[PDB]
């Protein structure tokens, strides 16, 4: 006898068929994937083919209404961890994949789940009625696993590895409300999804692995475990990422931000080199030239140095200029050490070296006001400390070092200084907006300031944070590879961030912005107990990313 | 007709073979291990190899997330009691070992366990995902036992007892969260692991009893019952350990601290002898050389006679200096009965023998400041009482007894000394951090005070508890042996203290520090009713130690 | 490539007048108790020998990087001591500045290449220099 309480790795449990799984589909799938040649990696006795391996886990609570979606997977060789390795030596794939669900509940629970394979060409999200497709209904009291097969319903004769085309989507939604007849704090059970290729899965043509690599067919390898723990910086301050900042209002970052199409709207390369502009006018107030505040300005659009955009010099911060006058230190400003140099010889001036506040403004000879649009604006520098003399040369130049620190009027730290009310954006960049319970996030790094240059993380004076839209390895890999055929609009590419106590998901839209499903919470995420990052793949944007840190 | 509620000692239950148990692995194991000669203790009728016997027990909480480690053991003869008895009687082994798990839960529980056998080359830590290996799933409502056999996968032809090399590892983690539908106080069940050798297990060479190499006998012998309720002293002072106190936040002690791998980062060999220096200057304030306070200092690095490190003389305490001036005695610190002496075959001076407080200062003899880091500092010593003479020669030195006390001005309740903000550290020290609910602990003792000679544990005011990092018999037994392969890093060697009304588990990490699962409490735990100590062994850091106290 | 931040290194400036002086800073190698990797020098310090210079003469082939002197008791940088500081390793900081290659018995030495008004003479003072560095060249023309 074999009890139902212990299940083998190769045991499928009960096999739950659906009208979408037909012999005609299987025979047509084999017969027309044969245009790739003989099927490859089809040995039935291989260990990667015979066992089920983990794909996901999800929670089913009593508050989950009938029709609400709990699980959604897209047909891919990236669901299985071993067909994802084998796809790096083959140029195509076809066939189906089995999905084994193990429900972890007792015999006292009620409520049921429903499972349908959704054909390609149908939008996946809320309002998709899973119970009016051909479906299967699973109890909460299932002891044995329930494996359903996802066939290859494809309009192409095989899926190329780079662009697969249209694929089905397996949806597990709530059929009936899960009930606990006991009543109390214990109202949730868990369902584990595992996966294994079907008997008619195959790869079709071989190809050299030095062709389109793992970094060009999916953005799974961009956001790996050392990137988010201690190695990757951000794309604004070049500082070690120590957290995530949820932005419930939404923001819009243009500079050093790459979308999933391999394009940018900014004026900066994916690197932190210096800001060097030629022929911008420099000036200094009054008639006396001792301890004066050096000023520099140049119209946006006349920076003919960058092969990416003519708006601003490379590495210029996309922050509005905060106005200040006299010997008063401004609040929340990008300042960076630099100098004024004569354009005719390239020689920097001896005495005009200071920490210059860099930003975007509107009227440089008159009243200095901040701005966000680059149109009709100008890139404006002005030193925050005293400079002896000052170059009043009109064709003069400005050279400012790459990384920047925070201007703070006192020793005490302030909030994260690129707030969305002052981030400079060209006309045309799309904005990150909260979709469902998923709010956009930034990537906080500890950035020191001009009030305490000894201030580190956890300083008793107060810790200072600067935020970026993307990690630098993420936007470095996004500029080098194109992932248009990896995510439709209205979809996220989700990773899982396992922590020491909890676990929580982030997702990347086609715009390039990252999202965590935290709702309206503004509390910074610690990112210190982060142990593991793994990808799970394309998911709907209107499906809440999980977030529990307790 | 056994009903399944009662299991025989020889009964495995349901056998669950994942993918590693194969017939030709067994054949390639048996035939290959004839390089040790004829196999020994291979009689498949002996009761030590036909019955399952107790190995370990572990607790499965409802708070253990999926993927959390519950029970991992490397392949060893030490996983069975009688194989651990015979392993000191033999010098090599090969073959598998069966693991019978018995889950103690009723039919109202839910949740699953997952068990895999990990191949020998794979590193086991935070990034290991166990559900993506060939595995088996076990329900919490398992009545009959489940037996998972780990085979002998090895690149060597056998396993030497002193250096087995690459072994497989059985890893049993949480597949699904444990659920109690009642909720309430009951939030954990227990699983008992029994063990029995496989059909192909054997020993080879005999060797003399107690004679093996690497994987030195696990450090179960350096911490026995008396250490806590009898002999056994501290690291800063020579007193009996009257209790343990948990520090929330962590600490760092690097004076008499030896790590798993035999090494020290600091001075002061583990013996309370005396403090002696030869080079260093003496000075006194005041124009009159009568009723003054002597002032000795030397720089950190003039300890030429110290053979361990140059930064301090041998026996000099790691207490930052408390700056004081006048007839008011300082608050806490390290004073000691000592004297001054001159160099060039010079005996100590008769008229100056006094209690001197020692420490590390910066900016002597002007504004004396306490010092946190050992590098870039200077050692200092000055009298707390009056002495009618002072010497001012440039070569001068101390002679201070090695046992020390704490100088308290009014001396009522006070505070345990030293605090975690008062311990000096060499550069490059490892820092103790709270992992999960486990906090570092630190051993207290009763120490006399200068204000009150009767510092007895009774009436007339509460006592002063002087605190040290690790016990001195542990340091004495661990300064010679090397335990680099005894304990796998990322876990700790846990014991089991048994009081008169409860029990508390104490873990010992690879840094030499001790961990307890008390939580966020600063309550001193009194070792008066402690009876006996029984070792448990290796347990990972994700498991929380128990705190069942009366 | 993060910044160079050292606590308690002595700072000084020559002469008695404090206008357009060359700011100087030095700290013994081995007393940088900030790095969890080695105590020799602060994190990001260049492994280049200090090339000596004096007066208003620009040195040849030196690591220079923009920075400031800050008071250690509060962390506040000074307003006026911001310049391009040459960073290197030397042997005698109060006496004759000579280059060195071995870290043993040497010191990490900073000294600005342009004029600085006033100058902190505080012994426990600190130095904060930005991460990336540029070349010091005595003329417009490049060198090896």
């Amino acid at each position: 006898s074999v009890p139902g309480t212990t299940t083998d790795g190769m045991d499928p449990g009960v096999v739950a068929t659906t009208s979408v799984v037909t012999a005609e589909n299987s025979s047509a799938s084999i017969a027309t994937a044969g245009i790739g040649g003989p099927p490859q990696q089809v040995d039935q006795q291989e260990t990667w083919r015979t066992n089920f391996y983990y794909n996901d886990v999800f929670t089913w609570s009593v508050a989950d209404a009938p029709g609400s979606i709990l699980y959604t997977v897209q047909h891919s060789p990236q669901n299985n961890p071993f067909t994802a390795v084998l796809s790096q030596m083959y140029a195509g794939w076809a066939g189906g994949m089995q999905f084994r669900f193990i429900v972890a509940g007792s015999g006292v629970f009620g409520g049921r789940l429903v499972a349908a394979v959704i054909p390609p060409g149908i939008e996946i999200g809320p309002g998709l009625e899973v119970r009016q497709f051909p479906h299967v209904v699973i109890d909460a009291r299932s002891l044995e696993p329930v494996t359903i097969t996802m066939p290859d319903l494809r309009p192409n004769m095989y899926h190329p590895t780079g662009d697969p085309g249209l694929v089905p989507t397996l949806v597990l939604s709530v059929y009936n409300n899960l009930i606990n007849p006991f009543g109390g704090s214990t109202s949730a059970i868990q369902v584990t999804v595992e996966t294994r290729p079907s008997e008619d899965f195959e790869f079709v043509m071989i190809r050299a692995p030095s062709s389109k690599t793992v970094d060009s067919i999916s953005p799974a390898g961009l956001l790996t475990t050392p990137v988010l723990t201690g190695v990757g910086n951000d794309n604004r301050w070049n500082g070690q990422i120590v957290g995530l900042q949820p932005v419930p209002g939404g923001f819009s970052t243009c500079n050093r931000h790459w979308n999933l199409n391999g394009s940018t709207y900014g004026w900066s390369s994916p690197r932190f080199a210096d800001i060097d502009h030629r022929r911008g006018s420099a000036s200094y107030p009054g008639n006396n030239a001792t301890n004066v505040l050096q000023f520099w300005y140049a119209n946006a659009g006349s920076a003919i140095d960058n092969p990416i955009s003519q708006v601003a010099p490379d590495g210029f911060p996309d922050m509005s200029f905060v106005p200040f006058n006299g010997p008063g230190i401004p609040a929340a400003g990008w300042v960076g050490f630099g100098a004024i140099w004569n354009s005719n010889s390239g020689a920097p001036n001896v005495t005009t070296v200071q920490a210059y506040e860099l930003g975007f403004a509107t009227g440089a000879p008159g009243n200095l006001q901040p701005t966000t649009n680059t149109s009709g604006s100008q890139t404006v520098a002005k030193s925050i400390y005293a400079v002896v003399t000052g170059t009043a040369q009109n064709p003069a130049g400005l050279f400012v070092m790459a990384s920047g620190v925070i201007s703070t009027p006192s020793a005490n730290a302030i909030t994260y200084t690129p707030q969305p009310d002052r981030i400079v954006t060209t006309p045309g960049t799309p904005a990150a907006a909260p979709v469902g319970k998923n709010t956009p996030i930034m990537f906080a790094s500890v950035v020191r300031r001009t009030g305490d240059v000894n201030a580190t993380a956890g300083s008793a004076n107060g810790t200072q944070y600067g935020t970026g839209s993307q990690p630098l390895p993420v936007t470095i890999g996004l500029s080098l590879n194109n992932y248009s055929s990896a995510l439709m609009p209205g979809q996220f590419f989700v990773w899982q961030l396992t922590f020491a106590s909890g676990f929580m998901e982030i997702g990347l839209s086609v715009d390039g912005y990252f999202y965590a499903g935290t709702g309206a919470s503004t509390t910074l995420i610690d990112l210190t107990e982060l142990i593991d990052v793994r990808p799970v793949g394309p998911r709907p944007s209107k499906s809440t990313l999980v977030f529990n840190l307790g």
Side-chain angles (χ1 to χ4, degrees), chain A:
Chain A
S1 303
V2 177
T5 43
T6 312
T7 172
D8 202 24
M10 333 214 323
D11 192 28
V14 347
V15 183
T17 195
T18 294
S19 265
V20 88
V21 175
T22 49
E24 29 265 280
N25 155 86
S26 303
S27 77
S29 178
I30 292 160
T32 199
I35 210 170
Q40 305 281 304
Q41 313 283 338
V42 288
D43 200 359
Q44 290 301 310
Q45 273 335 116
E46 293 279 334
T47 315
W48 67 275
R49 211 164 238 276
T50 47
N51 281 64
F52 283 97
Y53 301 106
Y54 169 82
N55 183 265
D56 209 26
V57 76
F58 60 94
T59 322
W60 177 22
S61 90
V62 303
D64 291 1
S68 70
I69 293 168
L70 309 187
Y71 177 58
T72 283
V73 83
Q74 220 187 251
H75 199 17
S76 185
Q78 314 285 130
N79 308 329
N80 209 55
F82 294 105
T83 62
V85 175
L86 289 159
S87 70
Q88 325 167 345
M89 72 192 72
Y90 289 111
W93 64 274
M97 182 156 299
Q98 309 179 244
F99 291 89
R100 180 177 85 166
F101 308 96
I102 292 190
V103 195
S106 42
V108 309
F109 268 95
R112 279 166 220 245
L113 286 177
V114 85
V117 176
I118 314 296
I122 309 181
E123 202 251 347
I124 302 297
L128 165 82
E129 167 99 6
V130 190
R131 316 172 270 183
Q132 277 167 7
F133 281 81
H135 59 260
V136 70
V137 186
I138 314 148
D139 222 307
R141 305 177 262 151
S142 322
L143 175 78
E144 253 209 290
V146 191
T147 290
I148 95 176
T149 305
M150 170 147 197
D152 211 12
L153 321 151
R154 47 171 157 81
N156 269 8
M157 320 216 285
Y158 74 100
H159 305 272
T161 287
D163 54 81
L166 290 187
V167 286
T169 290
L170 170 61
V171 182
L172 262 278
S173 96
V174 182
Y175 184 76
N176 270 109
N177 251 309
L178 171 92
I179 63 133
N180 192 24
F182 290 61
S185 55
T186 167
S187 49
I189 64 173
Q190 269 175 2
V191 190
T192 317
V193 193
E194 302 213 341
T195 178
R196 165 177 97 176
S198 284
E199 317 254 337
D200 75 321
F201 187 82
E202 65 200 68
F203 295 94
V204 305
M205 270 137 281
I206 210 181
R207 54 113 167 157
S210 43
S211 307
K212 35 180 62 190
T213 35
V214 315
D215 221 356
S216 63
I217 87 178
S218 77
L222 297 186
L223 196 112
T224 193
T225 316
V227 160
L228 273 197
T229 48
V231 175
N233 313 311
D234 49 23
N235 56 12
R236 191 171 269 132
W237 303 95
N238 215 13
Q240 199 206 6
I241 292 179
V242 316
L244 314 175
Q245 181 56 72
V247 197
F251 66 98
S252 193
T253 291
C254 159
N255 194 51
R256 220 181 264 109
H257 179 96
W258 257 258
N259 50 33
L260 266 284
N261 221 71
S263 323
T264 192
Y265 303 100
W267 47 90
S268 296
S269 45
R271 96 179 76 261
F272 273 95
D274 40 41
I275 309 108
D276 191 31
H277 191 222
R278 176 175 270 268
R279 54 201 60 241
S281 146
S283 61
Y284 68 118
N287 196 261
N288 159 283
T290 43
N291 306 47
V292 305
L293 288 188
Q294 237 290 328
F295 187 80
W296 184 87
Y297 101 92
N299 239 37
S302 64
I304 319 105
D305 291 304
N306 293 3
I308 58 200
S309 67
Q310 318 270 0
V311 165
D314 207 308
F316 206 96
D318 57 358
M319 287 174 78
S320 86
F321 192 91
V322 301
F324 76 106
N325 40 55
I329 294 319
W334 198 101
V335 297
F337 300 93
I340 313 273
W341 54 280
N342 175 218
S343 53
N344 311 116
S345 65
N349 301 132
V350 166
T351 173
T352 65
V353 174
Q354 215 45 246
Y356 290 23
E357 166 133 44
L358 251 67
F360 279 75
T362 34
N367 188 41
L368 268 189
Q369 277 325 99
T371 188
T372 288
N373 227 16
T374 62
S375 309
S377 77
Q378 43 212 0
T379 67
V380 161
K382 191 214 235 203
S383 48
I384 76 183
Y385 302 135
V387 155
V388 192
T389 78
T391 319
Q393 284 215 12
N394 180 64
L398 171 91
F399 161 72
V400 169
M401 213 42 146
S403 300
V405 315
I406 312 298
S407 65
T408 48
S410 82
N412 267 29
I414 56 184
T415 65
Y416 62 99
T417 89
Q419 300 267 334
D421 47 274
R422 32 192 305 280
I423 285 176
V424 171
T425 350
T426 57
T429 102
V435 47
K437 267 255 297 163
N438 311 321
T439 171
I441 56 163
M442 282 190 274
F443 289 87
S445 98
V446 170
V447 187
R448 64 181 21 96
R449 34 189 205 268
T450 69
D452 207 328
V453 283
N454 207 186
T456 88
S459 168
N461 194 297
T463 165
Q464 185 47 62
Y465 285 113
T467 52
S469 56
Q470 312 183 288
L472 246 204
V474 168
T475 182
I476 273 170
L478 274 168
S479 59
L480 301 169
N481 311 287
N482 195 8
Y483 315 98
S484 318
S485 71
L487 263 196
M488 335 171 81
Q491 268 191 332
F492 284 165
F493 200 93
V494 187
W495 301 267
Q496 307 239 7
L497 318 183
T498 326
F499 283 80
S501 93
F503 100 105
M504 74 133 281
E505 280 172 11
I506 76 175
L508 172 67
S509 70
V510 289
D511 263 7
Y513 298 105
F514 284 85
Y515 292 77
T518 60
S521 149
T522 82
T523 278
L524 190 124
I525 322 289
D526 204 4
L527 230 46
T528 297
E529 331 306 0
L530 181 58
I531 48 177
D532 193 45
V533 180
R534 70 162 192 109
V536 282
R539 293 258 192 83
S541 295
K542 271 194 258 288
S543 286
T544 162
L545 306 160
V546 314
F547 177 76
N548 56 344
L549 298 188

